[PDB]
Design a protein around this ligand. Sequence first.
Ligand SMILES: Nc1nc2c(ncn2[C@@H]2O[C@H](COP(=O)(O)OP(=O)(O)NP(=O)(O)O)[C@@H](O)[C@H]2O)c(=O)[nH]1
Ligand SMILES: [Ca+2]
Ligand SMILES: [Ca+2]
Ligand SMILES: [Mg+2]
Ligand SMILES: [Mg+2]
Length: 166
Amino acid sequence: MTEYKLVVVGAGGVGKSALTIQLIQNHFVDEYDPTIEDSYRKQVVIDGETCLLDILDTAGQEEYSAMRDQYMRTGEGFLCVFAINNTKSFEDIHQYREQIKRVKDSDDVPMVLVGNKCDLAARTVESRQAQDLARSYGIPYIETSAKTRQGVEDAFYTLVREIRQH
Ligand SMILES: Nc1nc2c(ncn2[C@@H]2O[C@H](COP(=O)(O)OP(=O)(O)NP(=O)(O)O)[C@@H](O)[C@H]2O)c(=O)[nH]1
Ligand SMILES: [Ca+2]
Ligand SMILES: [Ca+2]
Ligand SMILES: [Mg+2]
Ligand SMILES: [Mg+2]
């Protein structure tokens, strides 16, 4: 069938693993175990097409960031994740997009900007700010909560739909 290689990137603690695990395994990981590099696979039907999703869950911690470049190289589409209660994670999105552009040697790589932890009330990144960033990149902005599952499928499926416009 059709395989889509998705890669989840972004600062430490923003919820990359929680997001991926919610999508693939349908539960919320409450604890924080920093990731090195993990992969998940799942068959799903997206807009009538049977899809194999290969999802790479990457390290956001510099200390665990080892050979992230080598893992990112294979990706066909990237979720760039920040947390809406972590202004620095938003400010650092550019670093991740730059790394993507380097590893893919392209300025045209499918991506979605994701503002996670939208269930939390200590918001310091307003939707409009993130929309403006996404607009400058020519990509969608979607808010998610790995905790409530809000927007989780939408984020990943939207990325698949971006890969398809490639
Ligand atoms: N309230 C809330 N907490 C969340 C959400 N997503 C993740 N968390 C919490 O935030 C912490 C970090 O989540 P995690 O998914 O491990 O982050 P990460 O981006 O994978 N970290 P790392 O880069 O170190 O691997 C965990 O305690 C997790 O429960 C969310 O949408 N809402
Ligand atoms: Ca643990
Ligand atoms: Ca390069
Ligand atoms: Mg993780
Ligand atoms: Mg402000």
